[PDB]
Design a protein around this ligand. Structure first.
Ligand SMILES: OC[C@H]1O[C@H](O)C[C@@H](O)[C@@H]1O
Ligand SMILES: [Ca+2]
Ligand SMILES: [Ca+2]
Ligand SMILES: [Ca+2]
Ligand SMILES: [Ca+2]
Ligand SMILES: [Ca+2]
Length: 182
């Protein structure tokens, strides 16, 4: 049975090799069991300095969500997160606006909707719009990583053409696609 909570299923992975792009982080995910799991219920992380994978920086980055960590990982030079689950969205047009260091990829219903396939200092990107054809829980996954240095990850979403944006949080996230009452 899978835990039902108002969030995405989160996995953290650290490494002492360099993460340069999405494929490097995906290879890390596929190489081993997660160094820690957590519930990603408020997806607005960072900003911090001196490497996400060192010391208590992951805890600081994840903020409130860190109370659901399965373990406190040891030190690594590089690290990142893989999130997967569901997000309630009505039919319509949407776009992400993401502040991040380093890169990331967000996919909904199997289609990339926000991608930065490289390392970067903290930048905000307003991504192109996409459509949701039918209201309900949509499948979503996210990758983000830190190659070292500073780290931040805040992928906000707009339903009104970029006039207002919201964080993905427990109001609309579901780990399994069933309605959470938590
Ligand atoms: O090259 C990207 C790198 O630029 C700067 O060193 C700040 C870092 O956080 C970032 O990872
Ligand atoms: Ca794995
Ligand atoms: Ca630690
Ligand atoms: Ca249908
Ligand atoms: Ca590195
Ligand atoms: Ca960084």
């Amino acid at each position: 049975p899978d835990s039902l909570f108002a969030g995405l299923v989160g996995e953290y992975y650290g490494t002492n090799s360099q993460l340069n792009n999405i494929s490097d982080f995906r290879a890390l995910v596929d190489s081993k069991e997660a160094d820690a799991t957590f519930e990603a219920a408020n997806i607005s992380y960072g900003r911090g300095s001196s490497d996400v994978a060192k010391g208590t920086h992951l805890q600081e980055f994840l903020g409130s969500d860190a109370s659901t960590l399965s373990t406190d990982p040891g030190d690594n030079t590089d690290g990142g997160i893989y999130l997967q689950g569901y997000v309630y969205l009505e039919a319509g047009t949407y776009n992400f606006k993401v502040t991040a260091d380093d890169g990331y990829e967000i996919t909904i219903n199997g289609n990339p909707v926000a991608t930065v396939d490289n390392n970067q200092s903290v930048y905000t990107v307003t991504h192109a719009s996409f459509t949701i054809s039918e209201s309900g829980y949509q499948a979503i996954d996210m990758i983000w990583w830190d190659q070292g240095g500073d780290y931040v990850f805040q992928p906000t979403l707009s339903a009104d053409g970029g006039s207002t944006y919201f964080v993905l949080d427990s109001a609309i996230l579901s780990s399994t696609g069933e309605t959470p009452y938590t």
